[PDB]
Amino acid sequence: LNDELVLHNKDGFLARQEFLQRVGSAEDERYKELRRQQLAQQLQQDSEAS
Amino acid sequence: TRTAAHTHIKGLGLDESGVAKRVEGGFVGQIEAREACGVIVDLIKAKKMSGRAILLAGGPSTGKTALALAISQELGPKVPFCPLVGSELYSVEVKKTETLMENFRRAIGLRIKETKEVYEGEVTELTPEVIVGLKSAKGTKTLRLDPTIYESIQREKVSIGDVIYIEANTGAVKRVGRSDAYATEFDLETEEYVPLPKGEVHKKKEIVQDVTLHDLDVANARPQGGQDVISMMGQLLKPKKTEITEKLRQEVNKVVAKYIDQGVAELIPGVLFIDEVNMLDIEIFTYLNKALESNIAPVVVLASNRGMTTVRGTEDVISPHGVPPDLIDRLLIVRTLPYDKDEIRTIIERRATVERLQVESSALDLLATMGTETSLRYALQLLAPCGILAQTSNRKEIVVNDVNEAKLLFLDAKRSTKILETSANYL
Amino acid sequence: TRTAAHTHIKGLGLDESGVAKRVEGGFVGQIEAREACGVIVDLIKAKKMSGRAILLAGGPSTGKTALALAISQELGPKVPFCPLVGSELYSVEVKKTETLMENFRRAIGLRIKETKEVYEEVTELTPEENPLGGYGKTISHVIVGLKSAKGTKTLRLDPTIYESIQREKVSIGDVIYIEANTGAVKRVGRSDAYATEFDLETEEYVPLPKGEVHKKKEIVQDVTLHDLDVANARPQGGQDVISMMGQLLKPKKTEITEKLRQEVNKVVAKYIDQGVAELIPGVLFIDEVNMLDIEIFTYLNKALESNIAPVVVLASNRGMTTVRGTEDVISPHGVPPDLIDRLLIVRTLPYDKDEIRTIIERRATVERLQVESSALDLLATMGTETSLRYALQLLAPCGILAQTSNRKEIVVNDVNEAKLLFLDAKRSTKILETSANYL
Amino acid sequence: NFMSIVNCLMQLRKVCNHPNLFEVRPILTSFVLEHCVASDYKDVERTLL
Amino acid sequence: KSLSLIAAHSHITGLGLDENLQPRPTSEGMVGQLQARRAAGVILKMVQNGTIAGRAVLVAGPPSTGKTALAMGVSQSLGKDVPFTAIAGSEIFSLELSKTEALTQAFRKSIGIKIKEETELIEGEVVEIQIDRSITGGHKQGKLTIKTTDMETIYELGNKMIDGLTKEKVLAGDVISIDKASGKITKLGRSFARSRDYDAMGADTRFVQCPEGELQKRKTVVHTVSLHEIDVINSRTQGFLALFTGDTGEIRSEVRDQINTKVAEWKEEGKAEIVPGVLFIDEVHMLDIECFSFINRALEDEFAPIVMMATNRGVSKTRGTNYKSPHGLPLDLLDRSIIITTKSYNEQEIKTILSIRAQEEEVELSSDALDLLTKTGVETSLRYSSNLISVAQQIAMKRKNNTVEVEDVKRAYLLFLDSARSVKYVQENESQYIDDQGNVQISIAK
Ligand SMILES: Nc1ncnc2c1ncn2[C@@H]1O[C@H](COP(=O)(O)OP(=O)(O)O)[C@@H](O)[C@H]1O
Ligand SMILES: Nc1ncnc2c1ncn2[C@@H]1O[C@H](COP(=O)(O)OP(=O)(O)O)[C@@H](O)[C@H]1O
Ligand SMILES: Nc1ncnc2c1ncn2[C@@H]1O[C@H](COP(=O)(O)OP(=O)(O)O)[C@@H](O)[C@H]1O
Ligand SMILES: [Mg+2]
Ligand SMILES: [Mg+2]
Ligand SMILES: [Mg+2]
């Protein structure tokens, strides 16, 4: 029972877990993008209304 | 344990250095073909180009479909795959080219993730507009919901004290049963009481399911999963498959591009395989030129065991492999060689082993000689009747006399043709 | 401000007493054909006698389509005109003969007259009770009032109209027009009188109508019997079962029976006898008729002896060809001889160098372009040498090339370069026969 | 992944659990895409009418 | 945007030309075809002018000589706002639609119409929403305070607007725009104002939006539609669904003529603008004589976009006939069309195109490898080398060298077969395949 192991591990628990880690990294980068946009808006408003 | 002409092919058996051995992966010979097939395997694994065309051509009994199955198996299940036969293109509900495009859009996969929100608990009260009250093992919440699923619950004969399961995203409604807290109310009640669920009524989960573009297109054009009366009442009105406008494909492409750009999905190219493409019409053949020279069309592989033939749909042009030069120019050709005696013997013994049959060496020599005499497929077909004939005499092995008896019992192509030529009334 | 090989033909250019000059209506040459076609226009305008056919024959690029367009322009925008090609007769939804019958009915139109009295803010509304029976509750009467502009007036009506206006979802203070014929009323909108009722709104301001409380207007409508019978056959309505079914039915046209034709003929006959309706026979045009088939031709004969057959005009350019569908029948213009016996033939002739040059002048003038005399003279040279249409199409690229070097007019070398750039049929087939690389 | 003091802990979890705790089979449901083709096409048809 | 991995024409970018309509020897990803490029630029200028309609242009030449490349180049140089429909010959032979009906639909597809609708839209950040019940004094109570960057004011309800706002669960403090001419709430995002309380939305609203200040704004909306969309919308009760599903089913002609008249009225009134789109048909030699006959008339109409056609064969039998007509087309169409010819390529041009493909496909080509690839291409065909270049990469980093060399090209050439070599092998091995008469020699021995 050997070939089925390699036909099943191509997309198994670890591959799906690593893909979920990829999407987590992506959404964390999106949160970083939101944070930098918000802080830049704060800096702009610190001089456009003070 | 069903076995049918395949399942002994466990892969190309190619080395990581791109040099194929002699006997491996249930394969013998065809070193050049296997090497080229592995090269194409890495080509598709690159997932960078699109609309590439490869045709492999060779005589019968040369494992062309075996090679296609081998590359499909080597790629694995992550990549989409869809085997096809040329005759399957012709339909009566939609034009042939539209079916070709439909199979094009089913040959590329998309891996997507989304959050599933559900609410499950005990039925407490039903206040019309619609507000519902749910009781969990420890929690309890009241939910306001659309009257559509309220009417669905009414259709679902949900009683008081029951436990239900709701999918918030799709509005899916399903009743688990009734709580065992109020269970032995009747001596022989038909309803099957079920225990109370454990956990909060509100629950969030994650999925990683995969879909193809054709699935998205048909889902957008044809909704076929409704629950309320209006939904299936509408969807039963047009059962016939219709055409799909190209603008729908462009809109779907835009939305999937947005999804992958945002970063919650990625695109997976795939392989489309058409077997016995010699019989395809001229119109489809000239349509392939436009279809391939696109941006999203996946790689395609064709098979044709022909020679100097006229392609179907015309009566003048004689082209190799039944493919006109216009499609040949955008095509890569792989040559398959006929086998020989020792490879035939190895194939026969391997097929016997995968059929868990015991065979004596002289019987293998007789089988190889006969296979060279007539064909490999003939011996492959008739080996199992030899096994049963031996089994009748309560012998687990194969003897030459048994093989000769089976060959006497069952005919081949040449003997049948010779009998037909000298026949009373076209026997 | 754009044209496509036409729209410079303004009528037929036939004077009184049936005479055609040289240059008129953007038309030059082929005087006798224009005379004959003007006679045909007179016959159609007689509106007395219908069921004729006329086929005109000639070579390519002769002006047959131009002749038909001149006919249509001369007739005017009142009589219907249905251009068509042979190929459109074929269909995957109904029979070829049937589609021919819809086109046949579409050719002839009818002008109908009818007067309507309509009543047009709303002062008030009030219903008036004991039903004296088993009914639950009702109103004996309903009294309403309309403001309008030319004075206001109250109005007494039946709770049916009250129900209808309630279904229209109209505010008490609003502008309303009510149809006296059947009682159908729609929400005109929020009248201008109650402007800025609140700070923000969405309803249209609908300025109050300027007119009497009740207004009578004359309506003249021009429709064809083809609209009539499809309107009769197609169902209508709202929530009734067949209404939703037809709303979801994908209403493909299917094989209109002759019973509707008989019924509509009877109704329009009694209406024109009453004197309210007037029938205007039309003309139907079939361009490039060689693409038809034997079945269409035989049913065309049968429909040509029909009662309400409009005058049809046919176009072709074939010669001693074999009509499609069969192979043993060699007939002129690919039209079966029995059909040929049933109509007239108008001959057309090829132009000369002078006529082609005049065509080029007219075509250059209409597109607001300047052409040098020598350039135009040479344009006529390969107009005669190759074809009229090649030189006609060549003009616009020459104008573009003139635009390149900032010169409004067109010069000899510009058109020479244009000819070098774009090849004609003869040169193209010369290259095709010379080469052997699949070209 | 140099550390291995618990690298057998997931093996023990695998043996005892029988993947009914690592990942259980869910109630399968289709995708719930919501953008719709007619999201930005009602304005044009309304103006046309 | 425009998701795509790699296309056979991903390198061509809108032709290449000067202001004097002179093609540069190498511009925007293609080389050669000077006269064809100049003719294509001429046609492009025709389309830009928009004062001409119903002109037929045909591109002819040997296969694999910049035909579809030229079509893609003119399509890209045309840019947006000008409709462009590329259609193959075999896409019209449908059992649901007649061939002439499909051609009509394509022609109506390639006609651009620009419209301008004026609506009074009010936007701005809100603070809360006031929705009251019906009481003795009046209908309802409502006073919306709306804030922006510059100045903040207050408005009142309109009876219907309570229902409109209660249709959706509108959260207090979001940027929503109202067009009183329509009343449609456009919840673009939440109120920016101060992001200290709005720093952890968890994605959502796409970084909201900074309020613009002034509120009373009336901005025109430009909408581009084609005739097909209008007639399909008019045809059925819900024509948009039919447009998105393709079940139009032989739209009736009187609708089309009414649409033509009414859009002409709009053009004279200044409400509408007409854009002369382009229709392109490939391998038109696969068309039927009925289609050609219908085209012959449909071309002359005023609503006829410029149509470009490309074929490969020459002196062939037109489908539906039995005579080998020149160019595989009816003679009358050849009379009514203008022919553009493309000539064979040169070794320098083929090597430049191969290098363009190499840099396009992230392929690093050694000079000797380029020479060998050019030799193979000129020996057999452009596409053979254009595919071998991509295939040899896998061999290149199967030996762990990123840059391809001569040995990889030799291996690819010896691994994948050419049409000439394949036909030679097939002819020398005729008994091994299936004959045209079904004669097969499966048996190696006897
Ligand atoms: N190297 C091999 N190993 C195992 N089986 C093979 C091999 N080559 C050919 N075969 C067998 O030969 C048969 C022919 O395969 P297929 O391509 O489907 O038919 P054909 O070769 O006639 O087109 C297959 O059933 C396959 O099992
Ligand atoms: N006497 C004329 N005056 C102006 N234009 C003409 C004249 N004769 C032909 N034409 C041109 O020829 C075209 C019509 O060609 P036509 O003769 O209908 O071709 P066919 O003979 O194939 O039907 C029109 O575009 C028109 O501009
Ligand atoms: N001028 C050019 N520049 C770059 N590539 C070209 C050029 N001309 C042709 N090609 C190549 O040729 C292919 C297009 O072939 P094409 O001439 O359209 O075939 P056909 O003649 O059958 O229409 C494209 O993949 C493109 O890479
Ligand atoms: Mg096979
Ligand atoms: Mg004509
Ligand atoms: Mg091409």
Protein architecture, described:
- Chain C: It catalyses: ATP + H2O = ADP + phosphate + H(+).
- Chain C: One of its GO terms (molecular function) is 5'-3' DNA helicase activity.
- This is part of a larger assembly, with one copy of chain A (50 residues), two copies of chain B, one copy of chain D (49 residues) and one copy of chain E (446 residues).
- Chain A is an all-alpha fold and 50 residues long.
- Helices cover 84% and strands 0% of the residues of chain A.
- The longest helix of chain A has 36 residues.
- The N and C termini of chain A lie far apart (73 Å).
- By secondary structure, chain B is α/β, with parallel strands linked by helices.
- Helix content of chain B is 37%, strand content 21%.
- In chain B, strands 6, 7, 8, 9, 10, 11 and 12 form a seven-stranded mixed sheet that branches. In chain B, strands 4-15-16-3-19 form a five-stranded parallel sheet, covered by helices on one side.
- In chain B, helix 10 packs across helix 11.
- Chain B is extended.
- Chain D is built from two helices and no strands.
- Chain E is an alpha/beta fold and 446 residues long.
- Among the domains of chain E are: 106 residues, RuvBL1 DNA/RNA binding domain (OB fold (Dihydrolipoamide Acetyltransferase, E2P)), CATH 2.40.50; 80 residues, Helicase, Ruva Protein, domain 3.
- In chain E, the strands form four sheets. In chain E, strands 2-11-12-1-15 form a five-stranded parallel sheet, with helices on both faces.
- In chain E, helix 3 packs parallel to helix 8, helix 10 packs across helix 11 and helix 11 packs antiparallel against helix 12.
- The longest helix of chain E has 17 residues.
- Chains in contact: A-B, A-E, B-C, B-D, B-E, C-E, D-E.
- Chains D and E meet through helix 2 of D and strand 9, helix 5 and helix 6 of E.
- Bound molecules: adenosine-5'-diphosphate (3 copies) and magnesium ion (3 copies).
